[PDB]
């Protein structure tokens with residue numbers, strides 16, 4: 001039984017869902033209320049605690065790594081990075097050490113899809129996570145990892161029905177804070193009469209697109225999985241042909257010389273471990289801290305950033321076809337040297353001790369951009385199972401003038417980014433968030 | 447200036463070249479003679495020497511790694527691998543230590559293409575490499591690395607003309623013997639009047655296809671680059687749709703728990719360092735040795751295998767469409783856990799101390815297969831800059847009965863493998879060699 005290589009293309013179904021905002025379950029206006037209601041019904045709150053009051057976590061003796069005594073969950077370890085300028089790397093030279101999150105296991109982030117009245121809906125979960133700054137955001141249907149093996153609906157993803165897979169791909173998490181970690185992003189259709197429990201809501205993609213314009217609503221794991229949806233390209237031209245884009249990126253992945261090693265947390269230079277936080281000696285980057293989730297239900301470390309981040313794509317129409325200016329970013333926690341990232345991705349406080357000329361390219365342009373050139377803006381936060389209130393302004397900004405890309409940057413269409421999300425290690429988490437925001441703004445312009 | 451995303455497709459030109467065996471430069475029958483002649487004109491031979499007589503290599507003091515004093519070239523270091531069976535890995539459990547080759551630099555393997563009388567030719571180089579068992583084989587137009595910076599024609603690849611790129615992709619080298627190394631495989635067209643020096647010959651792809659049937663002729667780097675050629679699929683159906691194949695492989699990349707670390711060579715257990723070789727205590731796997739290339743022109747380490755290898759694809763026609771049975775192989779030197787590999791890939795001596803039931807799946811079937819089911823057979827050798835006479839029987843064998851793939855295996859069409867070679871870390875070096883052999887047998891059946 002062979003089938004066409006392109007069998008069961010879901011692009012028309014996806015497009016229909018993106019165009020529809022009347023969902024079977026709730027009108028969109030209500031969802032904030034439903035969220036507000038689950039936001040309100042949520043019993044759990046979170047308090048900062050000293051490391052010593054962690055239960056079942058400890059700084060293990062020889063490495064000083066922060067680990068769970070069961071071996072489950074993640075660890076905080078050390079990382080040393082050097083980017084060489086030498087005989088075989090373009091540089092410039094960079095060298096540092098930092099804590100890093102490690103968890104050498106792939107988790108499942110799965111969204112279940114099902115047709116109602118001829119239109120696909122997606123089963124979103126109102127989920128409390130301790131680092132969400134507003135506690136409850138909307139997560140994938142299933143968010144689970146095998147070292148924890150009961151999760152509702154995990155049977156639809158472990159293994160998925162091969163006949164019903166829309167998306168199934170490994171995608172990397174933040175390159176600055178995790179060491180080489182990816183999760184399996186999945187979207188799978190069912191025709192089954194699935195149960196519906198209070199924390200779940202069926203939404204069309206058009207409803208999700210409206211919600212994607214809201215601050216701190218569609219959570220980071222959901223935006224990563226939704227960014228992988230395979231829409232049909234409406235304008236199948238680009239400045240680089242797809243071959244030229246892969247050649248450009250090949251050169252970017254080849255031209256650096258970056259050497260990374262994992263080291264004991266106790267060995268990390270430049271960071272100070274106190275009774276309540278581990279922090280950089282000059283107050284940059286991030287802090288590791290500890291929280292209790294409340295009797296106490298559990299305790300765990302979290303990572304918090306030192307400020308609000310800025311993450312933006314500059315957009316230009318080239319012969320009528322919008323392109324975004326990607327950067328082939330080199331981060332210490334990437335598996336394969338570079339990943340494509342947004343035009344600007346940074347926490348501005350980390351550059352504030354430097355002269356303006358050492359700031360990331362385009363940061364000033366983005367920070368000064370007028371409302372009249374801002375095509376999309378919202379504040380989103382990062383995975384609340386690992387990060388405490390890590391927030392950034394996510395922007396899409398029309399560039400008023402043509403820009404000759406600097407080394408490391410290139411004009412790419414959003415459709416080329418969507419195509420690359422069939423594979424791992426091409427599009428980084430922040431760029432996947434902006435791709436989902438671009439797709440949302442295209443489906444349901446505000 | 448935007449262009450179609452599919453602009454400048456070379457598939458028709460490639461197909462024309464594959465169908466043509468009358469090349470502009472030499473009829474094929476002669477090339478052995480030309481090779482024989484360059485084989486004969488070659489002055490250099492190779493002698494085994496004690497490690498102590500290496501010039502400019504040494505076992506560096508603290509690590510005992512074998513390194514070139516200039517910092518150029520590669521190193522021999524140690525590797526420790528554990529595959530866990532535990533809470534988050536399917537296993538089975540494996541643990542070992544071994545020497546490994548490291549060179550954290552991407553080299554260029556480039557084939558230059560040019561039309562003569564309306565047909566693309568490719569400029570192959572008769573190149574002596576010290577580990578080639580017959581000294582001279584045919585290499586890409588340009589084989590070079592930036593830590594060595596004069597190489598003829600390197601200007602066509604550094605950087606390539608974006609308007610003339612046929613292939614440009616990073617592909618991994620052997621996972622058992624190199625630590626996470628890939629090289630940039632490139633095919634680039636020119637219309638320039640290129641010089642022609644005695645070590646170079648223009649060949650059509652049909653001529654290369656005939657030569658690919660010869661033992662020890664088209665060298666390993668050439669077969670890797672040629673395997674990346676993007677032919678049009680003649681039968682665009684398969685047992686797995688392309689999405690299903692990527693889902694299957696995603697699960698394979700997710701389901702193992704393999705932890706690898708680089709360690710000092712001096713720390714490797716189970717291997718003995720003598721005055722002339724480093725070897726496994728039970729005579730399995732490989733040896734590290736040293737050679738002089740001859741006054742002495744240079745000296746270097748080489749790795750030699752303990753026996754002739756066996757590398758084979760089993761083939762079945764499924765509804766008329768031939769598929770090969772790939773394995774998602776876990777090797778210690780892979781960057782991303784698994785790569786697709788041939789149905790059988792092993793050195794049989796490494797299993798010979800074990801009962802037949804512990805042998806790799808299908809090895810017995812392949813070793814016993816009749817001539818009447820062998821669709822392709824040749825002996826090829828591995829990169830002669832790093833390996834001394836490492837040879838394997840490469841086979842394509844028609845499977846007489848249907849096979850329900852065991853865990854880790856799946857039926858994939860050669861066209862699906864060709865498509866995946868646009869990206870890194872999908873198709874391993876031995877499978878890329880067999881893909882080039884399959885394409886050769888299809889173009890110019892013997």
Ligand SMILES: Cc1cn([C@H]2C[C@H](O)[C@@H](COP(=O)(O)OP(=O)(O)O[C@H]3O[C@@H](C)[C@H](O)[C@@H](O)[C@H]3O)O2)c(=O)[nH]c1=O
Nearest residue numbers: 094096097098174176285309310311345346347350392
């Ligand atoms: C963590 C750290 C970084 N560095 C160097 C490494 C980088 O060149 C530079 C910037 O560090 P980064 O962690 O890349 O931060 P950044 O400000 O450039 O980028 C950040 O953007 C935010 C939007 C994301 O939410 C963050 O996850 C992070 O990616 O500082 C140190 O010197 N010491 C350190 O301890």
Ligand SMILES: Cc1cn([C@H]2C[C@H](O)[C@@H](COP(=O)(O)OP(=O)(O)O[C@H]3O[C@@H](C)[C@H](O)[C@@H](O)[C@H]3O)O2)c(=O)[nH]c1=O
Nearest residue numbers: 540542543544620622731755756757791792793796838
């Ligand atoms: C090197 C080594 C391997 N092993 C284990 C690891 C693997 O499970 C098993 C087989 O080792 P491998 O290196 O994978 O060899 P193999 O015989 O399975 O595979 C070989 O096939 C040949 C065709 C290729 O040319 C080789 O490069 C290699 O891939 O032995 C050790 O226990 N100790 C060692 O020192």
Ligand SMILES: Cc1cn([C@H]2C[C@H](O)[C@@H](COP(=O)(O)OP(=O)(O)Oc3ccccc3)O2)c(=O)[nH]c1=O
Nearest residue numbers: 068073106107108143144145148183298299300385
């Ligand atoms: C840290 C931690 C968690 N939990 C509880 C709290 C929560 O009920 C539960 C699961 O926590 P987790 O594995 O963090 O997050 P996901 O479920 O999102 O799993 C995925 C992990 C990675 C990729 C995808 C999913 O364990 C604890 O009880 N103690 C701890 O220290």
Ligand SMILES: Cc1cn([C@H]2C[C@H](O)[C@@H](COP(=O)(O)OP(=O)(O)Oc3ccccc3)O2)c(=O)[nH]c1=O
Nearest residue numbers: 514519552553554589590591594629744745746831
């Ligand atoms: C080991 C070695 C080599 N050479 C000389 C011998 C030869 O003339 C020259 C280049 O040797 P090399 O870098 O090994 O192989 P390529 O040119 O194929 O480079 C690529 C490397 C990796 C990927 C692609 C290409 O240096 C030495 O002089 N001493 C040595 O120890």
